[PDB]
Amino acid sequence: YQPNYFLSIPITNKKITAGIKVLQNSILRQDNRLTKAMVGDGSFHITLLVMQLLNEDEVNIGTDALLELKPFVEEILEGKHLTLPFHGIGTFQGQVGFVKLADGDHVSALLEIAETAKRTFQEKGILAGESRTFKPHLTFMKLSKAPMLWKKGVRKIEPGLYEQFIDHRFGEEILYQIDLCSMLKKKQSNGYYHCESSIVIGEKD
Ligand SMILES: Nc1ccn([C@H]2O[C@@H](COP(=O)(O)O)[C@@H](O)[C@H]2O)c(=O)n1
């Protein structure tokens, strides 16, 4: 199925977004045709779960399911914070470029949150989740965003464009928020996706 909504972990740690800005600009000075493939400023996130929300009532149900997920996330983390380290560069088949979540204990916890997200949402009657294995990543570019490159001379991201950053520590994000976002509505003025609702992670209540 084709989702139109997702759970999003916003990656706003200044160091991370700044390092990605430098990455993106370095690529663009090498080949300015890649401009439209770059994800926009303010849009950086990790996708936690995809889903379909097809009317106003389901959207409101989506919001209720997100609220319910909150206590489940803190049980999984055992009264601790989740630290997401972002280090180096990967691609899905040269078509999507992303900063890679480093390996650690945090990876399994993240997977457990994603799986608990899917179950929480489905039990509310929401088509949520994918069959594909969950591979968290922080996208900085996707060629599908610039469909004119396919027709032009550009059918993959040249690994030479980012060679200087393949080992680069972008920084660490502590999980602080989960957003319910529209994939298709107009973005906020700050460049983030349209946000139906949000919950806080990692703070005193
Ligand atoms: N395992 C995965 C997970 C996501 N993807 C994606 O790359 C994505 C860009 O990443 P985000 O939307 O999650 O930032 C999607 O457009 C989808 O094509 C993939 O190609 N393989």
Side-chain angles (χ1 to χ4, degrees), residues 1-149 152-205:
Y1 77 88
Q2 192 91 69
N4 67 336
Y5 274 84
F6 62 113
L7 301 189
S8 172
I9 296 165
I11 295 302
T12 62
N13 185 261
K14 275 159 41 175
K15 185 174 149 154
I16 305 182
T17 51
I20 301 170
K21 190 49 148 179
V22 178
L23 168 63
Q24 287 178 323
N25 284 347
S26 57
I27 294 162
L28 297 176
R29 310 302 173 248
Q30 287 166 93
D31 186 357
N32 194 249
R33 297 169 305 172
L34 295 163
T35 306
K36 298 202 195 193
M38 294 305 175
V39 305
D41 297 0
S43 80
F44 299 96
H45 68 280
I46 310 296
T47 293
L48 178 67
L49 176 78
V50 304
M51 76 192 73
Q52 270 184 355
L53 300 188
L54 305 189
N55 60 54
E56 204 181 358
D57 300 341
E58 280 186 11
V59 162
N60 290 335
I61 294 158
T63 282
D64 293 345
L66 185 58
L67 291 177
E68 286 192 357
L69 181 61
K70 183 176 168 204
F72 279 107
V73 172
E74 307 289 8
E75 275 187 344
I76 291 160
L77 301 179
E78 325 200 334
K80 264 193 284 191
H81 290 91
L82 187 63
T83 302
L84 299 173
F86 290 104
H87 181 285
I89 309 297
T91 67
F92 299 118
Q93 301 206 246
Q95 298 304 313
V96 184
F98 56 78
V99 180
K100 307 173 297 181
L101 184 57
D103 190 45
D105 299 353
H106 57 269
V107 179
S108 41
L110 189 59
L111 271 33
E112 183 161 358
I113 291 156
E115 191 49 43
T116 301
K118 173 166 163 310
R119 195 194 67 216
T120 307
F121 277 72
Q122 293 206 166
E123 289 181 12
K124 300 276 260 195
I126 295 158
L127 187 53
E130 284 189 337
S131 53
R132 190 175 50 200
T133 305
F134 184 50
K135 203 164 149 195
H137 62 279
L138 182 48
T139 305
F140 62 89
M141 71 185 299
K142 53 203 178 188
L143 297 182
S144 69
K145 203 167 165 283
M148 222 87 75
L149 289 168
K152 212 166 282 151
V154 195
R155 291 198 161 114
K156 81 172 179 287
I157 307 157
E158 294 292 330
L161 293 170
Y162 57 76
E163 186 162 320
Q164 287 190 271
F165 294 90
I166 41 167
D167 292 331
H168 175 76
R169 176 63 52 119
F170 288 80
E172 322 166 21
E173 187 69 72
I174 296 171
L175 177 59
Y176 70 97
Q177 190 158 316
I178 307 175
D179 300 312
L180 175 59
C181 296
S182 175
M183 287 182 177
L184 310 179
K185 290 175 170 181
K186 275 189 205 209
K187 295 237 206 325
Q188 296 166 14
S189 49
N190 77 349
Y192 196 63
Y193 302 92
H194 173 281
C195 187
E196 190 62 32
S197 51
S198 305
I199 55 173
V200 180
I201 310 290
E203 264 194 10
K204 226 156 80 174
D205 263 31

